[PDB]
Design a protein around this ligand. Structure first.
Ligand SMILES: CCn1cc(COC(=O)[C@@H]2CCCCN2C(=O)[C@H](c2cc(OC)c(OC)c(OC)c2)C2CCCCC2)cn1
Length: 124
């Protein structure tokens, strides 16, 4: 399924190249411009734990990019997305909630998967 496909075929978009955040584009965007740090960003997402034990969906989620308001993986991943793009991210715990987790919702050393649609981004 989608998590396995990303694991096998996804681009490694971490700077350190440690496979911590893997990406596949699913639906292409419009324009060349991807959002700068500081931009208010608007998205629809689906999300789940590898554990199979929790699912979550926006189904408009709003955050300021690259400000650590979201897990590092989103700050990295969404920064590479263009308006109208849909992407799959698979994320190792180092780029999400780490060894501590975020109990009870997120366990220790969790791997996360997300499907993200980037709707738009305005400058702050
Ligand atoms: C106010 C900005 N914000 C940050 C968060 C923390 O979560 C996140 O940064 C990432 C990325 C952005 C979407 C939400 N998200 C998550 O991990 C989900 C998430 C959604 C949450 O609420 C919608 C949430 O509660 C605040 C939470 O707590 C750690 C984590 C998680 C995905 C795996 C399946 C369980 C939920 C929630 N809101």
């Amino acid at each position: 399924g989608a998590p396995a496909t990303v694991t096998e075929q996804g681009e490694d978009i971490t700077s350190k190249k440690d496979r911590g955040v893997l990406k596949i584009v699913k639906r292409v965007g419009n324009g060349e411009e991807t959002p700068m740090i500081g931009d208010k960003v608007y998205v629809h997402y689906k999300g789940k734990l590898s554990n199979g034990k929790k699912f979550d969906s926006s189904h408009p989620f709003v955050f300021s990019l690259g400000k650590g308001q979201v897990i590092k993986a989103w700050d990295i991943g969404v920064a590479t997305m263009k308006k109208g793009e849909i992407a799959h991210l698979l994320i190792k715990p180092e780029y999400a909630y780490g060894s501590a987790g975020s109990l009870p919702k997120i366990p220790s050393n969790a791997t996360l998967f997300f499907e993200i649609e980037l709707l738009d981004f305005k400058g702050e």
